[PDB]
């Protein structure tokens, strides 16, 4: 369903964190890992465009009542909540051969 709705940008967060556990296991069937790699790469490009639209919508979330570091810490947390997801997805793909499969799926 997520490979069907890859242009369907409304995506639940459950389907990716459940398929990452399908990537992490080794005794499963190899055909499930293709769709697991597809939903993982879809969440990766969704996190990338979420980071781009967070960086583009910069001056709406800034409050002048704070200091120069509190707004910086808030923006750093808002960016790290997308960066750690990509750091988890690529670390899950590191322990399998599906990280090569998303390379051919993207190209």
């Amino acid at each position: 369903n997520v490979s069907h709705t890859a242009p369907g940008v409304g995506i639940p967060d459950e389907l990716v964190t459940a398929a990452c556990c399908l990537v992490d296991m080794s005794s499963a069937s190899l055909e499930l890992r293709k769709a697991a790699a597809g939903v993982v790469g879809g969440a990766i490009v969704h996190a990338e465009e979420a980071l781009e639209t967070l960086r583009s919508g910069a001056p709406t979330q800034v409050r002048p009542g704070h200091s120069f570091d509190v707004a910086a810490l808030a923006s750093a947390e808002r960016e790290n909540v997308y960066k750690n997801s990509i750091l988890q997805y690529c670390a899950a793909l590191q322990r399998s051969g599906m990280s090569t499969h998303v390379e051919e799926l993207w190209s």
Binding site: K83, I86, L87, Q94, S99, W106
Partner: peptide
């Protein structure tokens, strides 16, 4: 349009500034 650019994972990791050794040792 940058259609000849690589669409692998490595440029995404270098945009975030991480190597694959850091991703093997993070969790």
């Amino acid at each position: 349009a940058k259609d000849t650019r690589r669409r692998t994972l490595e440029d995404v990791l270098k945009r975030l500034g991480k190597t694959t050794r850091d991703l093997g040792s993070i969790p």
